[PDB]
Amino acid sequence: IISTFDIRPIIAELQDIDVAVGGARGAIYVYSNLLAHLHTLRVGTIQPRKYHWHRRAVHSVKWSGDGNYLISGGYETVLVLWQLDTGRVDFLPHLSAAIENIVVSPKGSAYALHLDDNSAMVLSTAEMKPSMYVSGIQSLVLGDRPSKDALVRRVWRPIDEIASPLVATISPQNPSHMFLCVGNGQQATVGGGATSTPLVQVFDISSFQGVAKQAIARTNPTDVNITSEGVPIIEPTATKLAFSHDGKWLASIDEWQPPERDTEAYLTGSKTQSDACKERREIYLKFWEVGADQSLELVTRINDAHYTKQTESIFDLASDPTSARFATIGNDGMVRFWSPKLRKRDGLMATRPDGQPLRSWSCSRVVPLPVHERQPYSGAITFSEDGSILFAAFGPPSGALVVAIDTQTGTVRDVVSGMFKGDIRAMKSLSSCLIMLSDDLVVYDIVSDEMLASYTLKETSEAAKKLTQLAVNHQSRSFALAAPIPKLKRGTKSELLIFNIEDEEPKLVKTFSQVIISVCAVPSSSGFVVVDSAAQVWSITEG
Amino acid sequence: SWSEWQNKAMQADELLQNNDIQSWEELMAEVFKPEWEWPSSRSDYARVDRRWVVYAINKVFGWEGQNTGRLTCRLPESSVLIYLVDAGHLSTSNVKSAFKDDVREVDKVEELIGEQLPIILAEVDPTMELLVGYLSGTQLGSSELVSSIKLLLCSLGLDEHRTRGLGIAFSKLAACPAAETVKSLRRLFKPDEVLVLLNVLRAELIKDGWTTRYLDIQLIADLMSRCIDAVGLSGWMANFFSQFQAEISVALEGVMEAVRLKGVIAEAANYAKRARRALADSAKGKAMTVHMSAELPLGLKTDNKISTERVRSGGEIVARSSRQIGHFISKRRGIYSIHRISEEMLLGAAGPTVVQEAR
Amino acid sequence: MAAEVVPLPQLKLPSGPSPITAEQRYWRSFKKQKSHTSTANWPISHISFPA
Amino acid sequence: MDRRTAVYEPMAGQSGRWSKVFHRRYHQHDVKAMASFEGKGMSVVVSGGSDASPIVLPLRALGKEFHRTLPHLPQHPTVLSAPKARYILSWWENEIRIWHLLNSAQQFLPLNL
Amino acid sequence: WNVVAGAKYPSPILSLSVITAGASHDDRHLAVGMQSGVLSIRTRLS
Amino acid sequence: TADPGTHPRGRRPKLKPWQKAFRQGRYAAAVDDVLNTTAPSYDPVIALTLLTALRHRSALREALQGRDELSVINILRWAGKYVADPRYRSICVDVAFHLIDLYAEHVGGSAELATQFQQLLAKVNREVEKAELAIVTGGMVESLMMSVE
Amino acid sequence: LGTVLNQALRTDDSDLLESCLQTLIIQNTINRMDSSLAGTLLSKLAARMHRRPGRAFGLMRWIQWTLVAHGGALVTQPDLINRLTELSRVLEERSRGLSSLLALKGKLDMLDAQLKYRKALKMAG
Amino acid sequence: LGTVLNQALRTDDSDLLESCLQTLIIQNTINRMDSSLAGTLLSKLAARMHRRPGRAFGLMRWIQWTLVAHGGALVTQPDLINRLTELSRVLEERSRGLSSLLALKGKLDMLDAQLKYRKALKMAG
Amino acid sequence: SWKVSKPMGGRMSDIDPIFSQDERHLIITYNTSIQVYSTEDSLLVRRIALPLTPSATHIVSSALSKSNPDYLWVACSDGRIWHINWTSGEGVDTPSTIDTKKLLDMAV
């Protein structure tokens, strides 16, 4: 099955052509001479030369200049060069993502690669370093041309889908930059049945270029992308990532469980493969110190942040806007406050080699949450705009409840029940009121103990219900939610709603031709920044 | 649409100053959607709104401000009250929203209201069917549940409607976290009332059959452990605790025995199921390796049928050729087997009979 | 942007609630031991060195 | 010795330049010897290796016809029996191995096999 | 003033000094004189 | 002439042969070269590093499925020796799961492996008693922190 | 005791199986048992264990030794496999609170040893 | 062994502490131990139990009898609850892995049962 | 009160990123955008935004005009063809339809 082809002309006449057909099974078939074979009823026996190195489908094949070399690139992130005068083969093996497109310069010198993680690098030959690098937003895209290795019915057929919203924070102390979670490539992210986004990139908003990139969860770019069976490996996804008040800390959570096909031997009684994969989870909670050059450094990693007989899922974390403090809500029930102390065992401090002391984060406070079990609970938390009170929605189905907890003391200041119809999706705290969404969307003032605005959203599928989310502005008191318009596919529309804090009328109603995957709030000014599926970014501002 | 509810609340205020309870009750029936007949489901109630709930609790219940108040029945005989009980609107957040004025100076408000309210429902009905309905209907904190267990043990410790709620409140107070249960139990219980409760939980343990043998749980162990830590040494500091730990060691040995038998019996059942599948296919004639005799084999391994699909490079899936299926079957034979061909096979109808040497 | 080949990072395994500290290894690093006995096994009164 | 058979045809254009058209592992051990034949409407190349199976490849239609693995067992059956005594018998390098079977097949319709 | 580290010798010790190298006074070796009549010098070189 | 971001004197991190075999995808050679305990370059944290990498890359079954009798006894001996540490009890129990699922058929064929399956139950039986005594004792600590309040 | 266990199960008797249940001879008993008859022994042991939670110090040796010597005959009876796969389902349900019940055993081993402590101190003072 | 344990926990010895830990005696030792060194004993037992997993029985016995004997002696301390916190951490790590380890224990108990059955056959044959 | 900015950024389409003449600029065609970067400093010199608006119409192909350089040929899935010129933007607001059912490819 033909994935691509490149033709070179053998020449001011046209004497012959040489066709290189890169097929979807992995091979590259070189048909050497065609016009002298089909110029002449009867033809002689034509037989292509087979060059098989790629496991998956070969994405791009091109002849190189003089015609000595056949350069190529596939899913395996390796630019390969067939020597073609000898039998040999030489390759530039470990790029960031899949080699989705190559071109050769008008002269023989430069190659230009379109890498699958929204990038282009003009390489020079035999220096083999990118003399020109251009990066984009790299988020999850519903692709127009679907995939080049979704043609031949693999073990996991690659589907154009968005399962979860993009994890992104605009960073204070530098509001032009945007930290957001990405994988190695788009196809390598969505492959495997789960989002595998073990990296973040910092992306400039004011001039739309990807500034830098770094690993958060464990990644192996220099290892093989595919298992021996043929399934692409999944890497730990950074689910919750939120940024501190100062501009100097960053806390992320990354989860990984083994795939369902892999267990097969841990099943004993009523244990299914999903139950075994859920038992064998790995949920790390890592604290990053952000340097001045947007370089993240680890300070602590907590292997089991919420633990009982087995490890517990962490549903949300939030940063206190008045101190350096991260609250995390878990599946055990408890809300934990983490704070930075200095490393000091017996008065003898441990310092970095330049001299500054080593900070380390640890659980300052534990707050057990009250449960109210009428006859799979999820959580959400947010601080105030002032600090000093943390609102914690705890989330069994229909009966769920928010608890307002003091920060200085661990006592419960308030509890409010009966405000959730289904499972809680998110909760933010504007200046006095909690804006929370489940199947309903409710603005609920706690200084008056009174719900102002209540909406019953339209019933949709579970993927769209997962992909609805909101964000508050905290400078001009306005919040903004995002919901695709009713399994997900390519052509879907989404509409975002700009509300003020006080009224019930939506202050801006705009639908978009593609589904928006993230809304974020610029911390310095009013307004928002939205990121679309067909991955373009645009800003909304009042005035 | 706040002004419409404000006018309706002022009209109900006019009905209160007229002291005509009947049209007020009919207006609450119309809002909640006298005769007052019920639907027979605690779940299947129609959705009502928060301001009418707040007005209902504000008109029914009462507060005494002397630096600490007391909820009281302004309407002790009301279908509105039993509807609030059955529809579960009697939560502490609801009553605080109803009484934001008088309680904003009051401290320890959750403890006071959680102590006072089930006492009030119990003095309303001596049969406490309304208390058991409240236990089954409302979101309940640990103070409310320990006061409700105090009420049911006051009643006991026609004759099953109390023990049903006694079973309900154990499940709820086992669902609650340890801290609130311990602090509310230490507050509202006396160290001999806890001994009464620990005899009730021993009645739920021994009569259930744990100490009893065969030839002649997680929600009660939490309650026992939380009561024991809530009393502590300040309550007790006899042979009662030695026989107590004897029966708990007996129940623990029973649970560990159940673990061992669970593992062994589940593995033997799964092997028997898959071996039944393989023996049915071998009786069809697909000629797999099955064990003959009646003891279990060493490796509990059955040969599955060969799948119709093959995983090619790099990961793709193609159809198995019958040629390759025949190759794998030729591997699956042993070193000696008797393969009887029948005259029905030579006619083309049936299949063979294979008896192979046991490897 | 060919990523540089990194080897396998060793696991930062968690430590128990009494790890060997930097100062404990610093005072264990006074390694090489020479035991010079006094004449006629006399107990050592005083050692000293100038500032 | 990588049990690999590779087929080369000359590159079109320049003279004296060969290139590997395609390779395939026909054998199960190394390919120690092969010889070709081309006449009377038959162009074959027979490759014998260490797995005792001579594999016949079509030469002029290579990539167009399937190969053929000739049997490694000899053409003479080399298995002989005395049925009245139920002795089966087979011979190789200098030994003759005789088995006796002691029972019927109707008796067995697995610990006794 | 917490017990940061320590060590144990085979005799009741009577004199103890860590002594310094030279410029900036990095401590060369620790010598303990014990009741048994032994001077144990433990050397650290950086 | 040094590429920027490397060592200027030119010290590249050279690969140990188990790292090279794991990188190329030769997991049998990787596990053998790591878990050989007679070798002087033996390290349980290196063994945990390779086995966690072989759980993360989906290949632990592939690493264990090609063995012979003596090396199955060697991996069983490592699993028995190192289920005791709860810092890698999970990975060690997973390796023992795959070894039971793969090699429980020759246990009458070889007597020495039948001891090594019985000696691994013998230490698994002593590690529930250690895990039950630590949750017995964890209740008493929980009782004392309640009475402090 | 090999021939008393044969007759007690074919008639589905209630009393005669219990006469052999309380009394190495037990292991040598069931190695000579008929295997379709051996499944009748497992049917009633799974019948008493499923109806009520409890314990049995003697039946742990009994049930396991029959599932090894006579578990391969379980393929012949499709009724007993479903009875054993609902039996091992409910024996998980007793197993869920083993962690919470072990912590209860800790507090009773704490308080009983502390109540004995003060009583010894009154005779010590 | 009370005064020896007092000396070891008061001057942070290792030889005296290990030679009194390797060994009724334990009950008399913890009952004659000083009250103020109980938290030091808890920390120095948690350290040995983390550093070496094979000594869990005796060390849990020591911690058990210490928490029996000096319970309110740790509450009158109460700014030092962090030693009990590190102890809870060590015991939580010790009790990690229990459900999967029980599953693997059953998977091995089947093999041991079959091997013992074939040994019981081979001795009589 | 609230206003929405025009979309910037974009996802790089699988159409080949074409080199300019004399190898100094690279023309990369995104979805809804075509922008020219410089090879030396890797800073963009122009961004030619392209109005796409009909749910899934995509830029199908793009190539330099082989008769004369510094022109393009950009074609959508529906019938639309632009003849813009990089270093400027003359040709965005004047497309030319082609009366297709759906345009699968084009080559100049």
Query: Per-residue DSSP letters for A270-283?
Result: S--HHHHHHHT-EE
End-to-end CA distance of chain B: 83
SS3 state of residue B16: helix
- Tokens standing for residue H12: 């942070």
Distance from CA of H25 to the nearest CA of F (A): 20
With tokens 């592939």, the residue in question is F62
Q: Kindly list the distances between the CA atom of residue B283 and the CA atoms of B225, B287, B327, B332, in Å, as whole numbers in the listed order.
A: 57, 8, 21, 16
Distance from CA of D68 to the nearest CA of A (A): 21
Contact state of C11 with F6 under an 8 Å Cβ cutoff: no
The amino acid that residue B343 corresponds to is E
DSSP string, H12-79: T-SHHHHHHH---HHHHHHHHS-STTHHHHHHHHHHHHHH-TT--HHHHHHHHHHHHHTHHHHHSSTT
Write out the E strands in I22-80: 25-29, 33-38, 44-49, 59-64, 72-76
Question: What gap in Å lies between CA A451 and CA B105, rounded to an integer?
Answer: 23
The partner residues of A154 in beta bridges, in order of sequence, read: B316
Is the Cβ–Cβ distance between F37 and F78 less than 8 Å?
Answer: yes
Please compute, for residue A510, the number of CA atoms within 13 A of its CA located in the half-sphere on the CB side. 16
Nearest to E9 by CA among H19, H9, H15, H3: H15
Chains that touch F (3 or more CB pairs under 8 A): A, B, C, G, H
The amino acid that residue H90 corresponds to is V
Question: What gap in Å lies between CA E20 and CA F123, rounded to an integer?
Answer: 52
Nearest to A463 by CA among A533, A395, A513, A397: A533
The answer to whether the bond into B314 is cis (omega within 30° of 0) is yes
Question: What gap in Å lies between CA A341 and CA A339, rounded to an integer?
Answer: 7
Provide the experimental method for this PDB entry.
Answer: cryo-EM
Question: Which ranges of A255-399 would DSSP assign to H, the alpha helix?
Answer: 273-279
Contact state of C2 with A92 under an 8 Å Cβ cutoff: yes
Q: What angle do CA D15, D18, D22 make, to 5 degrees?
A: 145
Is the Cβ–Cβ distance between I8 and A206 less than 8 Å?
Answer: no
Burial of A126 (0-12, 13-18, 19+ CB in 10 A): exposed
Question: What gap in Å lies between CA E22 and CA G52, rounded to an integer?
Answer: 83
Is the Cβ–Cβ distance between A348 and C21 less than 8 Å?
Answer: yes
Question: What gap in Å lies between CA A387 and CA B11, rounded to an integer?
Answer: 42
Nearest to B303 by CA among B282, B289, B323: B289
End-to-end CA distance of chain A: 55
Nearest to A314 by CA among A296, A325, A327, A324: A327
Helices (H) and strands (E) in chain E, counts: 0, 3
Mutate to test the interface with A, among C1, C21, C26 (most CBs of A within 10 A): C1
Question: What gap in Å lies between CA A272 and CA I91, rounded to an integer?
Answer: 61
Question: What gap in Å lies between CA A338 and CA A320, rounded to an integer?
Answer: 10
Instruction: Identify residues after which chain E is interrupted (C–N over 2.5 A).
Output: none
Q: Around Cβ I52, how many Cβ atoms within 10 Å? A: 18
Note the residue count of chain I.
108
Contact state of B292 with D109 under an 8 Å Cβ cutoff: no
> Would you tell me which residues 7-36 of chain C have a C-beta closer than 8 angstroms to some C-beta of chain A?
12, 14, 21-23
Q: Is G90 on the interface with F (CB under 8 A)?
A: no
End-to-end CA distance of chain F: 68
Question: What gap in Å lies between CA A352 and CA A360, rounded to an integer?
Answer: 12
SS3 state of residue B348: coil
- DSSP 8-state symbol, G73: G
Question: What gap in Å lies between CA B208 and CA B216, rounded to an integer?
Answer: 14
Helices (H) and strands (E) in chain B, counts: 17, 4
Question: What gap in Å lies between CA A74 and CA A148, rounded to an integer?
Answer: 9
Backbone torsions φ then ψ of A196, nearest 5 degrees: -120, 90
Question: What gap in Å lies between CA A390 and CA F7, rounded to an integer?
Answer: 48
- Tokens standing for residue B51: 């301001």
Distance from CA of H8 to the nearest CA of E (A): 12
Q: Which residues contact B217 (CB under 8 A, 6 or more apart)?
A: G53, G94, G96, G97, G101
Q: What angle do CA A107, A113, A117 make, to 5 degrees?
A: 165
Q: Is G70 on the interface with B (CB under 8 A)?
A: yes
Question: Which ranges of chain F would DSSP assign to H, the alpha helix?
Answer: 17-24, 27-35, 44-56, 60-64, 69-82, 89-103, 111-148
Nearest to F52 by CA among F89, F26, F14, F84: F89
Question: What gap in Å lies between CA G81 and CA G71, rounded to an integer?
Answer: 10
The amino acid that residue A169 corresponds to is T
Chains that touch G (3 or more CB pairs under 8 A): A, B, F, H
| Chains E and C lie in contact, requiring 3 or more CB pairs less than 8 Å apart | yes
Nearest to F92 by CA among F52, F59, F128, F61: F52
Q: Is I31 on the interface with A (CB under 8 A)?
A: yes
Going by their DSSP bridges, the two strands E38-43 and A433-437 should be labelled as: unpaired
Backbone torsions φ then ψ of G122, nearest 5 degrees: -75, -30
Question: What gap in Å lies between CA B7 and CA A277, rounded to an integer?
Answer: 58
Backbone torsions φ then ψ of D59, nearest 5 degrees: -90, -55
Nearest to A296 by CA among A286, A306, A305, A304: A286
Helix (H) or strand (E) holding A480: strand A478-485
Contact state of A417 with B91 under an 8 Å Cβ cutoff: yes
Chains that touch D (3 or more CB pairs under 8 A): A, B
Among chain H residues, the shortest Cα distance to E6 is held by H12
Question: Which ranges of D36-105 would DSSP assign to H, the alpha helix?
Answer: none
- Tokens standing for residue B209: 């059959």
Q: Which residues contact A125 (CB under 8 A, 6 or more apart)?
A: A108, A109, A110, A111
Is the Cβ–Cβ distance between F84 and H53 less than 8 Å?
Answer: yes
User: For residue B298, which residues of chain H lie inside 8 Å, CB to CB?
Assistant: 111, 114-115, 118
Q: What angle do CA F50, F54, F59 make, to 5 degrees?
A: 145
The partner residues of A450 in beta bridges, in order of sequence, read: A445
Cα B245 versus chain centre, distance: 27
Helices (H) and strands (E) in chain F, counts: 7, 0
- Tokens standing for residue A193: 């049945």
Instruction: Identify residues after which chain G is interrupted (C–N over 2.5 A).
Output: 23
Write out the E strands in A173-295: 177-182, 199-204, 210-215, 237-243, 249-256, 282-290
SS3 state of residue A519: strand
Backbone torsions φ then ψ of I73, nearest 5 degrees: -140, 110
Q: Is C6 on the interface with F (CB under 8 A)?
A: yes
- DSSP 8-state symbol, B354: E
